[PDB]
Amino acid sequence: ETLQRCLEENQELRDAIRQSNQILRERCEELLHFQASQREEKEFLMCKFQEARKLVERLGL
Amino acid sequence: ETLQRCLEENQELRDAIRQSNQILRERCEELLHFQASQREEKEFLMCKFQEARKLVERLGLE
Amino acid sequence: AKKSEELVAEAHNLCTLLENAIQDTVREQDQSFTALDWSWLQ
Amino acid sequence: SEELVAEAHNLCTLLENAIQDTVREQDQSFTALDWSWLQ
Numbered sequence: 001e002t003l004q005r006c007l008e009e010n011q012e013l014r015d016a017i018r019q020s021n022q023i024l025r026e027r028c029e030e031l032l033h034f035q036a037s038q039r040e041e042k043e044f045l046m047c048k049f050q051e052a053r054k055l056v057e058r059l060g061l
Numbered sequence: 062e063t064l065q066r067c068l069e070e071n072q073e074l075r076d077a078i079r080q081s082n083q084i085l086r087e088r089c090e091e092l093l094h095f096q097a098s099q100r101e102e103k104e105f106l107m108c109k110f111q112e113a114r115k116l117v118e119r120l121g122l123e
Numbered sequence: 124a125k126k127s128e129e130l131v132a133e134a135h136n137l138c139t140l141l142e143n144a145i146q147d148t149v150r151e152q153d154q155s156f157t158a159l160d161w162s163w164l165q
Numbered sequence: 166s167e168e169l170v171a172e173a174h175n176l177c178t179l180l181e182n183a184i185q186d187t188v189r190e191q192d193q194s195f196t197a198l199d200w201s202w203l204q
Contacts, residue, residue: 006067009166013074014125016170017134020081023177024137027184031144034188035151045106045156045195051203052113053163059120070127077131078169084138085176091145092183098152099190106156106195112164114202 125133 003064003067006064006071009071010067010074012167012170013071013078014127014130016078016173017074017081017130020078020085020173020177021130021134021137023181024134024141027180028137028140028144030184030188031141031148034191035144035148037188038148038151038191041191041194041196048195048200048203049109049113049156049159051200052117055203056113056116056120056163056165059117059123073127073131075166075169077134078173081134081138082169082172082176084142085173085180088141088145089176089179089183091149092180092187095145095149095152096183096187096190098149099187102152102155102157103193109156109161109164110195110198116164117202
């Protein structure tokens with residue numbers, strides 16, 4: 001029947017959204033971790049190139 | 062009426078996934094763009110690292 | 124189960140969060156080393 | 166609808182891949198370079 005066909009589609013629709021929702025959720029957490037990794041790489045790189053600037057100046061004197 | 066509640070929910074869910082799909086595509090494109098700028102930034106930093114290593118080489122031979 | 128109103132809200136809020144995570148990542152990265160004074164390279 | 170559902174799976178897979186690539190590229194770190202010429 002009509003209600004059973006309709007309920008099969010309903011479940012299929014909810015399963016889909018529920019699956020994407022879990023993917024978004026995990027991907028979002030991953031991207032938030034990547035922001036920490038990204039600020040850490042940059043912080044390291046700022047230090048390193050500040051060190052380089054200081055050496056170069058230092059050596060110039 | 063139970064069938065009516067279902068067809069109305071199916072249309073709402075279908076609408077959400079249809080919106081959601083057009084949004085996912087846009088998000089994928091931003092990430093592609095973000096990969097192109099990450100790549101330009103590293104290439105730039107690699108030139109700077111190289112120039113700075115060589116300038117320190119130069120100066121240390123005062 | 125979830126009410127339908129509810130699955131859609133969740134999925135809407137998760138969409139927003141991903142758009143914002145992306146934007147935040149892109150904004151922090153656009154905060155670029157090229158904007159620094161490298162004229163010490165001389 | 167079967168197509169909307171198939172497309173969504175397809176876009177999620179692409180979003181998955183796109184995020185993975187990004188967090189693999191940014192894992193090639195400058196911490197790997199030799200910085201000992203700083204002394």
